[PDB]
Amino acid sequence: SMSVKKPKRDDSKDLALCSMILTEMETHEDAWPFLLPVNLKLVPGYKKVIKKPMDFSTIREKLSSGQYPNLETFALDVRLVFDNCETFNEDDSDIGRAGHNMRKYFEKKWTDTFK
């Protein structure tokens, strides 16, 4: 509350560390469904169904231009990529499996880096 603060966590390396995680996601072999925005002219249903499209390139641009206020807003966008994937894709498809794998991969790096 006012004039009553928890001890200051060092957040000065967050930007760099989120960048590294993102690089690791970008370079994973199962990243391909997620590297670029889904082409809303060519994929029927996507525009109407997925209210908030998100992809790694878009996260990368946001990160690089100071549009994440903190590491939670970064993790929200990453998770949105996988949540969107689950909404549109059957679990038993290549893309559906890619999404499960990438989420698992992300969540481990996130825990190991920050928790």
Full set of structural domains in the chain with CATH:
1-115 (1.20.920.10)
DSSP 8-state symbol, 40: T
In degrees, to the nearest 5, what angle opens at C-alpha 30 toward C-alphas 25 and 31? 45
Two structure tokens written together for 4: 């009553």
Residue closest to 91 by CA, chosen among 101, 77, 78, 81:
101
Residue 77 vs residues 1, 59, 63: alpha-carbon distances, Å: 29, 7, 11
Technique used: X-ray
Question: Taken in order 114, 36, 41, 85, is the CA torsion positive or negative?
Answer: negative
CA end-to-end span of the chain: 24
